[PDB]
């Protein structure tokens, strides 16, 4: 049950913080900017903490591929068909923060090649490896939806807050399907 989705534009800074919990509203808008910027900084820290053993020898370019789930999304815009993608896809952030485990929630992070960051907080604590695949598939779902309804928007400056009407309701429906 993904209870909160937030996205960081390219350089830190928050542009979308719609949450789907029943009623908590504990964190004001101001603190969530600090949370997102801290996440970006911690991502940067995590990039430069690889162990010495793996820096000179990776030999692991077979596990980066994400297996695809059939219908994780729902049950479209520029896309067409029963789903946004049927094929398996590859990981981009092979040297960055990927999730955060906690006994009360689990945070997943999916970084676009360009730099867009999509963060999903789920109340559910899966073998702690399949859930990565579920989260990556769902977040690429959300990224495709964003590329549809936020990028093809004349009244939207780049890397600024996403004040739109179709995008938020469609991601709300998408997360409602996934539970």
């Amino acid at each position: 049950a993904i209870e909160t989705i937030l996205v960081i534009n390219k350089s830190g800074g928050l542009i979308y913080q719609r949450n789907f919990t029943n009623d908590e509203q504990k964190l004001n808008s101001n603190e969530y900017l600090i949370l997102a910027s801290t996440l970006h900084g911690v991502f940067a820290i995590a990039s430069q903490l690889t162990p010495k053993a793996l820096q000179l020898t990776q030999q692991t370019n077979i596990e980066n591929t994400i297996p695809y789930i059939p219908y994780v999304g729902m049950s479209l815009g520029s896309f067409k068909g029963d789903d946004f993608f049927k094929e398996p896809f590859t990981n981009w952030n092979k040297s960055g923060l990927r999730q955060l485990c906690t006994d009360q929630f689990t945070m997943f992070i999916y970084q676009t090649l360009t730099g867009l960051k999509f963060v999903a907080i789920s109340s559910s604590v899966s073998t702690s490896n399949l859930a990565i695949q579920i989260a990556d598939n769902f977040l690429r779902k959300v990224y495709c939806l964003y590329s549809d309804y936020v990028m093809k928007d004349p009244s939207y400056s780049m890397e600024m807050p996403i004040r739109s009407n179709l995008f938020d309701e469609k991601v709300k429906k998408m997360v409602e399907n996934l539970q």
Binding site: S11, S37, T38, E159, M160
Partner: protein
């Protein structure tokens, strides 16, 4: 409270020990996660101001690199549309490092970034070591605004910060227009059989 139309990223960079932490004591919402400077490298402050009838949120990143932050400090200028170079008029080393800081900003920060110069601890006229004329002349060649700030001389940095945000908003603001007798009654079908 997601009402702000624009989110500008500003970096408060300067020499260690200059007194940046006291410099951003005013333009803040003094709450939220305090410290965290030594943990990741930055502390965060925010300001809200209206310009041309449009709410603007400005996020201030007061980065500093002591011994550990080589690549991360560079990465923290990924999209900063503003900079607030700081030096103290007590020791010439801080003013000398301004060219090095500006070189890093213009090399790594966002293209055509609006960057300014702040002279902190100007109340202490006893140990002055950098004149206003030289600082202004250095600002002229590099397209920067320049000011001097002090605890007794407060409320100047606030005006300079608002003026910097206004300068930014006149550069990264796409022009827009305020987009804001329909038929009524029972219709009758007219589609062909």
């Amino acid at each position: 409270g997601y009402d702000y139309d624009y989110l500008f990223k500003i970096v408060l960079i300067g020499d260690s020990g200059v007194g940046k932490s006291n410099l951003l004591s005013r333009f803040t919402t003094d709450e939220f996660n305090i410290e965290s400077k030594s943990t990741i490298g930055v502390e965060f402050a925010t300001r809200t101001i209206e310009v041309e009838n449009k709410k603007i949120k400005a996020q201030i990143w007061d980065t500093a690199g002591q011994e550990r932050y080589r690549a991360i400090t560079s990465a923290y200028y990924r999209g900063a549309v503003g900079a607030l170079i700081v030096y103290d008029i007590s020791k010439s080393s801080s003013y000398e490092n301004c060219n090095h800081w500006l070189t890093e900003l213009r090399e790594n920060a966002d293209d055509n970034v609006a960057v300014g110069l702040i002279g902190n601890k100007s109340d202490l006229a006893h140990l002055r070591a950098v004149p206003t004329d030289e600082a202004k002349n250095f600002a002229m060649e590099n397209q920067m605004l320049f000011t001097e700030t002090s605890a007794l001389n407060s409320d100047n940095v606030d005006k300079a910060f608002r003026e910097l945000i206004v300068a930014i908003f006149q550069m990264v603001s796409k022009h827009q227009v305020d987009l804001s007798g329909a038929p009524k009654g029972p219709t009758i079908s007219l589609t062909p059989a």
